[PDB]
Design a protein around this ligand. Structure first.
Ligand SMILES: O=C(O)c1ccc(Nc2ncc(Cl)c(Nc3ccc(F)cc3)n2)cc1Cl
Ligand SMILES: O=C(O)c1ccc(Nc2ncc(Cl)c(Nc3ccc(F)cc3)n2)cc1Cl
Ligand SMILES: [Cl-]
Ligand SMILES: [Cl-]
Lengths: 122, 122
């Protein structure tokens, strides 16, 4: 019977993205070939089956550096990292293939489904 | 513009609350009189002016224990901590005063405004 604040979840995500933009309390660097990206492990876990399966393991919990598969495109990863922190996906014809490839690797089923719905109406 | 995922923010907050429930990557303990509560500093900062003002300071960034004002009711605090992680506020006639007192201290303006609208509507 609790009071529902319908803007609170989007407000928290916006603030977490602002902390990321300021490098505040980011605890991991994601290396994607020649490019590197800082992030909060909790956010990565909250969005990705890959990152969830890594950091829930007490063996890997404390890793400060994650090297992604060499085949992953840094731009495709960055669009997905932006999606994690904003709820907005930069999808188009020019990147649909690399974006879907990365979302499949990161195990982000809703992005994969949306990529499959983008193809179906292309 | 970019594709909007209207459930993504809520999905991220639910997953952060599940991580809290499993004590995964919690990095602070909030001491409230005889009681203690573990949490993610990022989430506390994202929801509270108090915690944002403490942890944005490089001097205080790495604190692992925050002792709140002795007057703060642990129950009012727990209701607000649950709100931070769920977007749902447990307000009643029996706790409005302690929850409002706590939200003023924690600098959570939207909760303070809702507490002011609860009083105005009996
Ligand atoms: O769909 C299910 O059956 C299912 C239900 C609940 C659940 N719990 C959970 N708790 C905390 C986090 Cl941080 C999290 N992250 C996450 C995991 C896998 C992903 F592909 C994406 C994100 N998931 C996990 C699963 Cl796999
Ligand atoms: O009041 C304003 O005009 C204002 C506008 C934007 C802003 N930016 C911000 N970026 C990151 C985080 Cl984690 C955050 N947390 C937070 C801060 C103060 C609060 F009472 C609650 C939450 N706020 C801070 C303020 Cl103070
Ligand atoms: Cl997804
Ligand atoms: Cl608030």
């Amino acid at each position: 019977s609790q009071i529902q604040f319908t803007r609170h979840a989007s407000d928290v995500l916006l603030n977490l993205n602002r902390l990321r933009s300021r490098d505040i309390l980011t605890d991991v660097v994601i290396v994607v070939s020649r490019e590197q990206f800082r992030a909060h492990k909790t956010v990565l876990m909250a969005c990705s089956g890959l990152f969830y399966s890594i950091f829930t393991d007490q063996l890997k919990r404390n890793l400060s550096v994650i090297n992604l598969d060499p085949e992953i495109n840094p731009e495709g990863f960055n669009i997905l990292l932006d999606f994690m922190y904003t709820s907005r996906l930069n999808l188009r014809e020019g990147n649909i293939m690399a974006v879907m490839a990365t979302a499949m690797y990161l195990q982000m089923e809703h992005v994969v489904d949306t990529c499959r719905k983008f193809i179906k109406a292309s």
